[PDB]
Amino acid sequence: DLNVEIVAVERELWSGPATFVFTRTTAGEIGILPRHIPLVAQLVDDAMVRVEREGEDDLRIAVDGGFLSVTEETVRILVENAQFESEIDADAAKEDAASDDERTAAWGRARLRALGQI
Amino acid sequence: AEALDPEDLEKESVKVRKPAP
Amino acid sequence: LDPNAIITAGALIGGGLIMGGGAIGAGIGDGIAGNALISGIARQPEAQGRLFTPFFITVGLVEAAYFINLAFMALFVFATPGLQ
Amino acid sequence: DLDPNAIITAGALIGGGLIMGGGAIGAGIGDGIAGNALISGIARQPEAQGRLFTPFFITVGLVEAAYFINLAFMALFVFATPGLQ
Amino acid sequence: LDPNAIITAGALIGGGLIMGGGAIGAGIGDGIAGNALISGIARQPEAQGRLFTPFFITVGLVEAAYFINLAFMALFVFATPGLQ
Amino acid sequence: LDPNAIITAGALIGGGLIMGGGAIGAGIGDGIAGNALISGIARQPEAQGRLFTPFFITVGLVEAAYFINLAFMALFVFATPGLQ
Amino acid sequence: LDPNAIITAGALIGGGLIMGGGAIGAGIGDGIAGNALISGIARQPEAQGRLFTPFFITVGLVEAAYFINLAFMALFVFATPGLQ
Amino acid sequence: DLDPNAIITAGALIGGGLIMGGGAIGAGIGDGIAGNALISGIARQPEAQGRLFTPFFITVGLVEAAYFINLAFMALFVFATPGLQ
Amino acid sequence: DLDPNAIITAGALIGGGLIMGGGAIGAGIGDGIAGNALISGIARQPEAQGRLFTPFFITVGLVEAAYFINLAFMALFVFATPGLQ
Amino acid sequence: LDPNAIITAGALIGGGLIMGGGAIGAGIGDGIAGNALISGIARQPEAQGRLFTPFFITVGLVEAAYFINLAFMALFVFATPGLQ
Amino acid sequence: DLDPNAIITAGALIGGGLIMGGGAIGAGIGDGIAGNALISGIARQPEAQGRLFTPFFITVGLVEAAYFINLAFMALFVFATPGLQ
Amino acid sequence: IKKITKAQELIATSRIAKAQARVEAARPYAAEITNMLTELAGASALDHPLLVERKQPKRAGVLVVSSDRGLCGAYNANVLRRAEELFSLLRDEGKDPVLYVVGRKALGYFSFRQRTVVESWTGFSERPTYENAREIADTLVNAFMAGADDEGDDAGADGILGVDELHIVFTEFRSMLSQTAVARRAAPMEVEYVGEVGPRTLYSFEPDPETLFDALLPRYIATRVYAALLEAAASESASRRRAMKSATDNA
């Protein structure tokens, strides 16, 4: 197993064991398994992170301003602001998606992706 | 007004894990 | 020995070279284009929609040469130029 | 006296050998390159395999085509040799 | 023995070599250039329009070499130099 | 002289070409696939098993192209078509 | 037998080899230099104009080997050394 | 006149040369590519020194597997020529 | 029956053709690869252009040299054929 | 025309093929392995000592093949099998 | 009626041409690849030249060693032809 | 009054607890981003505009962090005294201090002094969020970058006049009794080297170290600005508690 740590600027958002971490860096979609090589990457603007857990439903997070750091025995996603799947406001996420503002549109798209509507 | 002691001005730094060049 | 026999043997060897070169080029170039396509789809799945266009623009641009060779291969073995 | 059919058959055999040599080189290297892309894709994000099998077969299934086209013509060279007198 | 038959066989083998080499070069060069194009288009959609200029320059050079080879193969086969 | 002699010599040369091309293709394709496999194992060790399924699909499908050639080489040097 | 026929056939084979090798080299080198150019332009469009200077140098060197072969191929077939 | 066995042996010897040359090209280039992967992997991680040899040998064993097979058939070509008269 | 010098000259012509074909393949592909490295480097850091020419033209120097050696011996193969009896 | 002349000419051609293949393989394989070594040294200077163990192995394989070819060249040229 | 020495010399010339063609291909492409590595290293590490000469020159030494061994054996083929008589 | 000031002191104690909690909740991200920046710097070229000191620097952007509510005893006064000392130091080094402000109290103080304020942010000094820090750091970094092309007193190709340094004056919260106004040069950063720690297994960088460093340095600036704002809020609450204790004792 690997230790995922989703850490926002204001507070530490989540931490725990995981078996697989799927995200989308600026290079492209990336899956991380327990012994992945050390890595530092920048998540895409509207990135989404899926953390597959052992015996629980996979945790889907909409991320804003992500930086992935894979290390031996830990995977840290330093986010400017993240939101779990349950907390997503589907109507607001749809509204602010395709908005004129670039960052707002990216955040809305990330939330839609986390909801699975993509 | 008595100006800052130049040493009293904290400087933000980027630590680099290398020997000094 | 019949001169046409020598001409036909030379034509067969030449056409064999035609096909050998065409197959080498087509296989390797198409494999390289497919490498690019597979990598692009792996990194960015949505790009699958917008990637087939250049891919074809490559594959055809490769197959063309192959098929062109094919024509000339036939030209050597079915209507051999210079045949006596 | 040299039998003309003997010369024609020798030329046909050499031509078919060239056909299959080129086809084998192309097929082997193209399959290796396509498989390299596929394996790198799996290694990067191990759950993309099902997706990647679509473009992969489009590449390989195409590369093999060239090879097998050669397979036909080599046969046409050696089993029913054009120009046999 | 007819000298012209020997000349024709040699010319046919030479033209086979010409077109085999041309096919190998054209196929592999087109594959490599298309690989670059497909990768670029995959990792950023916006570049699709502006990424055909260098691609077409490269394809033009490659096809120029290929068609020079084709022209010289035609020269060898249809009008064999030194033919008697 | 014996026509069978020249026919068999041509068959030997053709089979040699078949096997040489097959060996080049097999060796280089296996090397490229193995490069991918080693790089992937270096990147994600825990994907090792998952990486063997595509690897085989490559190797098993490169080796095929090789062995078919081998088969035909036998057909060239043991039951030569056109032999008389 | 006419020795000049043998000389001309050998010259045709040699010219075919020269031009086929030149075609392979030119095509693959052009493709590689292209790939470099397309990838570089994809990474930074603002570098476009600043990449043609090296690229055309590279394309200058690649073809330098190709056309020389052509220059010598013309020597083989048209004015065969030791034609006698 | 010329001995037919002479033509047989010359053809067989050229064919064996072709077989061995193709095998050498394939083996050398494949080994180089696999070793490139191995060296890069070692450069990135020293601990990987342990595991990268497992796939590496699997690659090499495959590459050489072709080479020696050629080296077998080439010998068959040269020492016991099929179709020898 | 013919002038043996004719056979020797035909063989020399084929040998020189092979020499130059191999030399051209090597020169073209090697120069393409070196230029690919150079273009990528200049793309990364344009200010590095003047620097990158120092190793690049060493690499090219080592590539074309081989090619030109093939030009030398090929001439010795054709214009002044050894063994031309 | 004694058969020994034909057999030895075939032997020389075959040995030339063997060495050409061996040289191509050795050169390209050593180049690729050395590229990996140079890239590793650039990325991690201190790695030089650790990086020669695999590199040598790679070379030890590549060169080995070449040398094996060299050996058989002798068998082809100095003690020709099937010689009369 | 053919002069044996002439056939031997034609075969030797063709063999030497093959030797030089293979040597040139290997030398050119290997030097190109090694130079690509060197140029990329310089591009990503301007001061690296001193460190990076040693591996680059080891690679080039091996490549040119293969090329020059082939050159020597071609010289043997063409001048001191084995089996010449 | 005694009742009001006692209530204010109790509220200030609760707010100090909350502000310390917030200061502690932001520590892990700061540590991780600092470590990531250290790695990227070790594997990159240290020529980013933020890292290189401009030649002939002539304009420094000073961000003064004060409060909104004025019941703090000497919090704002000490912050502004430190800002004035920093202005004197900058004048000694021949630099014209352009001024940015957080909080209304410093706005009023500088308005009375007839000192132009380039920009000001207000209404969050009691509980600053990362959005405010990001906006402030964005503005400051944009000004600093615009200062790259400026020559003499001409904006240059930018079309906008920038700065050659960035400073932050704010109240560092040492403890419940010690809160010290400090000036801190946020940009350009002083690249300093430390001994070998780690590098046996190199980090892989996607796409490459330079792009990540360029994308991460502004984030580090914003993170440090956010930390300064949180410490300022904690210091403001501590000083307000002390001032209300003094007032209730006096009343």
Residue numbers in the entry:
A (entry chain H): 3 to 120
B (entry chain C): 525 to 545
C (entry chain M), E (entry chain N), F (entry chain T), G (entry chain O), J (entry chain R): 3 to 86
D (entry chain L), H (entry chain S), I (entry chain P), K (entry chain Q): 2 to 86
L (entry chain G): 18 to 214, 217 to 270
Task: Give excerpts from the publication.
The membrane domain of the mycobacterial ATP synthase is embedded in the IPM, with the catalytic F1-domain of the enzyme extending into the bacterial cytoplasm and attached to the membrane domain by a central stalk and a peripheral stalk (PS). The mycobacterial PS is made of two proteins, bδ and b′.
In the first element described before, residues 520 to 548 extend from the C-terminal region of α-subunits and provide a “hook” which catches into a “loop” provided by residues 212 to 220 in the lower globular domain of the γ-subunit, thereby tethering the stator and rotor together and inhibiting rotation. An important feature of this tether mechanism is that it is unidirectional, operating only in the hydrolytic direction of rotation when their interacting surfaces have complementary charges. In contrast, in the synthetic direction, as the interacting surfaces are both negatively charged they will repel each other, thereby preventing an inhibited complex from forming. However, similar to the F-ATPases from Paracoccus denitrificans and Spirulina platensis which, respectively, have c12 and c15 rotor rings, the mycobacterial c9-ring has a symmetry related to that of the F1-domain, whereas in other species where the number of c-subunits is not divisible by 3 there is a “symmetry mismatch” between the catalytic and c-ring rotor domains. Despite the symmetry correspondence between its F1 and c-ring domains in the structure of the enzyme from M. smegmatis, a symmetry mismatch between the two domains persists here also. The presence of this mismatch is demonstrated by catalytic states S1 to S3, which do not display threefold symmetry and are not separated from each other by 120°. In the mycobacterial ATP synthase it is not known whether the ε-subunit, which is observed in the “down” position in the structure, can also assume the “up” position, but there is no evidence that it does so.
